[PDB]
Amino acid sequence: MRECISIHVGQAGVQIGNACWELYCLEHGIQPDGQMPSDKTIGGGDDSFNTFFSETGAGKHVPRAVFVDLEPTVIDEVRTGTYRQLFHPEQLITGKEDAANNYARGHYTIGKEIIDLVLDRIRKLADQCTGLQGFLVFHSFGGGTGSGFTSLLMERLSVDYGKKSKLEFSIYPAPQVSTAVVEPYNSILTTHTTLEHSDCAFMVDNEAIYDICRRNLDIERPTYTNLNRLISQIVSSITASLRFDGALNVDLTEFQTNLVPYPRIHFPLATYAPVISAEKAYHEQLSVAEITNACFEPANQMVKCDPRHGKYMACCLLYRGDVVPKDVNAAIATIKTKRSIQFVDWCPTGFKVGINYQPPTVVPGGDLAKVQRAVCMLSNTTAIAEAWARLDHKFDLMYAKRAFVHWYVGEGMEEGEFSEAREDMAALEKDYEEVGVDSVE
């Protein structure tokens, strides 16, 4: 009835997808073989929740997703691991060669030869659906596939499907930490092509979750298995009202409206406040007021950006579990009282609320605890212009000497595409200033 297609692009989308479908199975009672044993004593219901899992008459449940990397190393871990009997065998690897961290290869050489094959399985999945609400693209700024192949896809998907929510959950490059020397080019050429096609892009940064895992969860040597489970919760909260009941339900078309003032500033951030271990799970009450304030603490942001250097435009608060609206209304009045959380003049009602009853589920082997409450904040702020400005400066240092361009030019790109992108990102940087000026009369 309500059905969402998730797309996982690259070595980062997948290892987040593996972190997601691990969780989507637990909440709904599915085993890794795709079977739902408990249904035999219900004889019905909708635990075979059609938002993510499609059911066969034999009792098996297939997830609605595409997994694409242009390399076999990451997906072949699925075909051989514990979640091999769950997915359709059509997981797409023409990855005889990778993109070499090159927007040109993911967009002009090797993004071809698989893109028509990728639209086919999506065209197949959608015809199995009735209420196609939107898409969920998991990718990473910094790669060739997650930057190039995503752009090429968001273009082609904006034609075959048109006016539907295309939500991105993207790993934004950290300011200092990085694992490549070509993230700026791949991140600036991506925004230039995705801005006219996407509808809302939720950013994350690994440099921040590393810090969150240190202070709160007391993990001093974490890895990506811990990071991606936190992301599995952000998406579960977003797509919860499409699965379970609640007091205030939130469709996908509500983030597109509340959090996008103008079509070019659709770059919000994500948080998850009650990230605490089983040790700190006691000793604390974990109220809505305890949780809601923790979503506004800059040290608990999943993107390395201080909103106190900027202003808020639209905030969306998604509540889970034993939550009562009186507890929420008292909280926002506390946040609107604090003067360090500044809102623009042209948005006095800068809050969106959603309440669902199903609490979060604890994955065995994880470091997160069991809680009766969980909250996810989605915020659009003017502070993220600082990060764009860093990225445009890095670009300028290494484009003025035409460094690394012959790798891009050698795979189908023109030198003029670099200058077009930088100016577009400069306009956006300027657009983030106009919205920060208080009007006069």
Added chain:
Amino acid sequence: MREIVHIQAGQCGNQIGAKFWEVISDEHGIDPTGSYHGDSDLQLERINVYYNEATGNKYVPRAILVDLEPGTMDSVRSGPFGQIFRPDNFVFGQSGAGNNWAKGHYTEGAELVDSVLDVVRKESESCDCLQGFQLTHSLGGGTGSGMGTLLISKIREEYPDRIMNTFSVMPSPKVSDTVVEPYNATLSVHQLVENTDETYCIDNEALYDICFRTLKLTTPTYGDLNHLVSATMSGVTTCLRFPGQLNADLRKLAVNMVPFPRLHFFMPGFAPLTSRGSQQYRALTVPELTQQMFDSKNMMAACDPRHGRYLTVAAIFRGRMSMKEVDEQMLNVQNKNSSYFVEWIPNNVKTAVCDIPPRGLKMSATFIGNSTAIQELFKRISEQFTAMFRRKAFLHWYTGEGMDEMEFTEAESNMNDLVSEYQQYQDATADEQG
């Protein structure tokens, strides 16, 4: 699928590569018959990168052994892992190049080169998708310098969209092992600059210091030295054979290591190397490995990076590492040692992590670095070269095989321009205001 063809030219490469298959087979569970006697199921998943399946799950490597002397090929056959190579892939002749680059390029090598292309075209066409090539040679002689550089000139024409990696033993600064090292090392650089994408520069005097200063070895043979080179050769090609959290092919490194098409000369390294006693007194962890990798006394290139600036470096990790422990540590280098890095590349470091470590170590690491301190090696040859060519000392053995003095002057000015391309970057730069 990312298949690689290995080519071994000279008494050096055929002595290195012969250990390279003693090191890879132990990692994939292959015995000296080609039979599989391993433990894990990840070995056979991507064994096709280096090996081919023959009849009964016997595995034959994609090696190519070339030389102008049959003595080296007899050592392989009459050795530990001699019975696995394809006996139709041993190409050889007699009456070797005589330390003459003129013979291995024009006169003798040109007679034997088409035989080498017969093997290459058969192994490449038999491969599903070619990632690139791999050559182990020694420039300083005539076979590896001459007959190797000639093959690269030809494969680059037939396979111009594929990687051509090269592991080259360079002339050493203090003591020579061939009187005409400069003429042969020079002319090779004139060709490698135009026809390569990654050239790993090795020097034996550094390995003599590694084996003495770190490993505390008092009698290091060439087996031990080549037991170090084979390691780095395995680290570069690890993320194609085993999985991990952040994988890196050959092209992803070069795209992240070659900022301009001519600066593809690297200073490799390996960690953690230790003596057999101090092993029980160390703690294996990333901050202990990163200190060895970035140590100037763990390089194989005989060049001090502290006399220059790292344009860009890489680090390939193998084990159940923590990524926060990795990303935190690489940042500590740039912020601490910011003078040894360039300003117009904000992050001068790439990282990669595999999940399946080496046979007996819970964690290993491989290091690749592009620095302006490689200027010192080329600037030396240019001094020795012109000192000899200005008097025309040994030139009549090169002209008598069909060469001219102009071809000696071209290679001089090219190598001198590569010096200037590295020297502009080494001096600290500054914009007007920035």
Added chain:
Amino acid sequence: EFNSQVTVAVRVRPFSKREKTEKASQVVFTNGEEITVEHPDMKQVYSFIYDVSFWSFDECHPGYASQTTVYETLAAPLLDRAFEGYNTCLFAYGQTGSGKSYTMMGLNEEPGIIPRFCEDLFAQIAKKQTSEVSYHLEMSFFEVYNEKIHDLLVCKGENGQRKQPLRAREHPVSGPYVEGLSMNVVSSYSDIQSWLELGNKQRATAATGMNDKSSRSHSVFTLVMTQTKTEVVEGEEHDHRITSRINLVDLAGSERCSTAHSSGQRLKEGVSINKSLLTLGKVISALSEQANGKRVFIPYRESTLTWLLKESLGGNSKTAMIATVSPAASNIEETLSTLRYATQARLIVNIAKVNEDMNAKLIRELK
């Protein structure tokens, strides 16, 4: 002591069939010397000054620069200096379908610069052909295609594939040159015209989305003129010789793969053109910064084009640039890249000298 500045000139082309089908707007306006670009969005206006500007937008409007006008304003000075004893270079630069080949070579009934140059050269020679001065003229015409060199002035043999590539080498004094190149003698305009026809027929052309006759190769026209003169000396006369190299260069365009619908050889050759322009650009950016005190190393070895033209962009030649631009609004950023590289080429300074063919010998020490 001499520091000859590079003569930059610009040529605005009229609308094309594509830019008339898509009713594209005029944004490049002129007033004479200056050229301005009013963006359609009307957020900022850029303007540039050049030594010479040409406006072929309208065949009726005053200021219309024709083939004869561009010749008499750009090439005729180069001919005067070439007779004086200087080396000369004239090279085009721009995007796909912008009027580079039309400007230099021209068509049958609309000649470009090359035929007019050779014609006026032979005319002045025939008018100054005394026993005091003799003249000897050699020509070459060659091609750069996928980083390979090719001779245009040969009648290829019949085969499945007959394009024998040549090699580039570095002579310690004369600089870079091509080994195996046909240098054909010429006595008058007819042989030049025949060789030009043969070369333009052997050159690489294809049909792409932005020009049906898109040149897929860089083209260099070299003229070596040796003029011999006398001086009354202790013995026989005919003891002075002056050599001059004239290099007329028509390059290709950047060719974005999206607009220029390209797959396979067109992509391949197009990509090669893109790598040749990136290198050339980097050499024009380093030569414009080396003329402002800052020390820089020009990368000429990263492309055969810049390697052969080492002596023209820099070194010893009086050189001139013809930037070619389109006035439509759908190509603003590419036109602006052309104009910025031209304004940087304006700052280049070379050291041009007379090729008396006598330095270090006897009259150097006379001097």
